[PDB]
Structure formats: structure tokens, C-alpha cells
């Protein structure tokens, strides 16, 4: 609206100057009547300008309320986020232990079978080394060359 105001200003200015100047050089009713029209329309635009100034003051109060509600929203957000993160790590470690419990639920063996199998796995040192071992000792945690060459696999097919 500033453009229309300023155009009405400069138009009023130099055309009123022209009316004054033709009066002065005489000693033009049409451009007079148009000057009357420009003056009235300029005063109407000044009234609209004061009204829009009231509108802008209302807008300033309103955007201050906007920023205050934005700050309230964000102060909800950050605290809800930190609560979310703490509970997320908590339920994650709990679901780790629950996964391990559910794997243990799948396999359930009688105790004597566990003891018997532990005896077969560690009567001869198969899964855990002999206590006095130096490199070059023949025994190994794999089958070994002699057990392979003396088994049914090596002998009975050959």
C-alpha cells in the first residue's frame, strides 16, 4: 500500500504545484476537480493506513503468543525424547535377556545326560587341553592322524 500512498503523494504534490503555478502565471476547473478527488482518496488511504497499523500491532501481540506456544511445545518435546531414550535402552537390554531366556527354553535336557556328555567330552582331553602341554605333544583337539588312519573310515573302505 506504500506504493499507492507514495504515488498519490507525489501526484498530489506536483499537480497541486501546477495548479498554483497556472494561477500565478495568470496573475482550470477540471484538474482542480481531479485534485479534489486525489485529496479525498489520499485521506481515505491514510485512514486505511491507520487501520492497518492497528492490524499490525495485533499481529505483533499474536506472534508473541505464537513463539510462547512454540517454546512450550519444544520443552515438551525434548523431555519426552530423553524419557523415550532411557526407556528404549532399558527395554533393549531387557529384551536381550529375554531372547537368551527364550533360547534356553527351547533346549532342556536331563541333568544326567549333561553330566554323561561332559564325561565323554572331557575324559580324554578333547575340548580342554591337558594341563602339562608343550608344543610337539601328539594330542590335538581335532581327531588326529592316528585315529583317522585307524578308524573304520580309513580302514574298512581301504
Amino acid at each position: 500500500t506504500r506504493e499507492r500512498l507514495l504515488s498519490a503523494l507525489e501526484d498530489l504534490e506536483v499537480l497541486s504545484r501546477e495548479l498554483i503555478e497556472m494561477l500565478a502565471i495568470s496573475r482550470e476547473n477540471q484538474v482542480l476537480e481531479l485534485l479534489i478527488h486525489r485529496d479525498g482518496e489520499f485521506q481515505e488511504l491514510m485512514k486505511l493506513a491507520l487501520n492497518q497499523g492497528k492490524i499490525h500491532h495485533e499481529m505483533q501481540v499474536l506472534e508473541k503468543e505464537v513463539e510462547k506456544r512454540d517454546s512450550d511445545i519444544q520443552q515438551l518435546q525434548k523431555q519426552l525424547k530423553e524419557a523415550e531414550q532411557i526407556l528404549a535402552t532399558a527395554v533393549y537390554q531387557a529384551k536381550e535377556k529375554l531372547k537368551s531366556i527364550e533360547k534356553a527354553r527351547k533346549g532342556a535336557i536331563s541333568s544326567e545326560e549333561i553330566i554323561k556328555y561332559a564325561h565323554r567330552i572331557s575324559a580324554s582331553n578333547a575340548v580342554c587341553a591337558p594341563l602339562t602341554w608343550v608344543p610337539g605333544d601328539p594330542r590335538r583337539p581335532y581327531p588326529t592322524d592316528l585315529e583317522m588312519r585307524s578308524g573304520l573310515l580309513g580302514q574298512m573302505n581301504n
Binding site: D72, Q75, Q79, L80, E82, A83, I86
Partner: peptide, 19 residues
């Protein structure tokens, strides 16, 4: 769990005080 609950609670306790 308890801490998270009371955390949520006090933040909710903050929000009508903004309203």
C-alpha cells in the same frame, strides 16, 4: 520404569503450568 513414569509425570506437571 519408575523413573520414566515420574519423568513423564513432571513434564505433564509442567504443561498446564504453561497453559
Amino acid at each position: 520404569l519408575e523413573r520414566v513414569i515420574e519423568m513423564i509425570q513432571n513434564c505433564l506437571a509442567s504443561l498446564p503450568d504453561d497453559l
